[PDB]
Amino acid sequence: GTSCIPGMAIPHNPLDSCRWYVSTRTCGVGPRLATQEMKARCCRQLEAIPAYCRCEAVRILMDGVVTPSGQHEGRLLQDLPGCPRQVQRAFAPKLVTEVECNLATIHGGPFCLSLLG
DSSP states (O other): OOSOOBTTTBOSSTTTHHHHHHHHHHHOOOOSSOHHHHHHHHHHHHHHSOHHHHHHHHHHHHTOEEOTTSOEEOOOOOOOTTOOHHHHHHHGGGTTSTTTTOOOOTTSSSOOSSSOO
8 A cells, every 4th residue: 555565565575586686786696597687587576566665675675674464574685605785785775776777766766765775
């Protein structure tokens, strides 16, 4: 509804596909899939989500959240060999920028103001 909460407004474990893409584009660390195929999927998920939830969905990817059912989901941006989470955290909020997914948000444009990174 008017609430960006994991359930409907925001899927369960949002932008899961953005976890492996944020590590490759951020630190150069590649898992198994090619950056473009990774970036296509990732951005596909951020699009599905409505304008006003996008920035929140990204924050959840980085830092996390507790579902109203007491269960927690998020904070996928965890350290990796050669890819500290602070590098990932720094890039993540850019997933909505023009150079990147170029998607409007709560603020009204392809940029997140209230996101840590």
